[PDB]
Amino acid sequence: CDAFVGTWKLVSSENFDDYMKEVGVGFATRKVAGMAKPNMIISVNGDVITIKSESTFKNTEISFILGQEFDEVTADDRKVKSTITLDGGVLVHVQKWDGKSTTIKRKREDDKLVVECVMKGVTSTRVYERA
Ligand SMILES: O=C(O)CCCn1c2ccccc2c2ccccc21
């Protein structure tokens, strides 16, 4: 994946509070996270992909190789087992913790980067555009 490379700003978000709630995010965290308009910076150095998220809420960063499981501390402080693959141009990211699972799909659509977050019956869609 490298059509994903760049700096991306959040411009729209749907159902993100519902999603965080379903994931188990406490109210105090949802409040600040929900108002957040993060900048997402994606870069690639060989087989290592780095995704940063910067906002007044929290700075986070993951570095990974496609198809190799890694430990992630999420923005909401979950300790999860993450695996990311590239599937028909789609970056598919699964987080597993406590017998639960959530999926984040990042895809390129026109000049948008579209992020779909799924937890149980809840689907949240977030759109980023180049900074
Ligand atoms: O990438 C996204 O836009 C949503 C998935 C990752 N993510 C955040 C990104 C920016 C700000 C807060 C959060 C957040 C909060 C809880 C869980 C996942 C989260």
CA distances from 102 to 4, 11, 47 (A): 21, 23, 24
109 DSSP assignment: E
74 DSSP assignment: -
- Kindly state if the Cβ of 49 falls inside 6 Å of ligand 1: no
- Kindly state if the Cβ of 20 falls inside 6 Å of ligand 1: yes
This structure was determined by X-ray
Do the strands 6-14 and 122-130 form a parallel or antiparallel pair, or are they unpaired? antiparallel
3-state secondary structure of 68: coil
Distance 75 CA to ligand 1 centre (A): 6
Do the strands 39-45 and 6-14 form a parallel or antiparallel pair, or are they unpaired? antiparallel
Resolution (A): 2.0
Q: Which residues contact 108 (CB under 8 A, 6 or more apart)?
A: 3, 4, 89, 114
Nearest protein CA to atom 12 of ligand 1, as residue: 33
Long-range contacts of 101-110 (CB under 8 A, 24+ apart): 102/23, 106/4, 108/3, 108/4
| Domains within the chain, CATH numbers bracketed | 1-131 (2.40.128.20)
Which residues are bridge partners to 80 per DSSP?
72
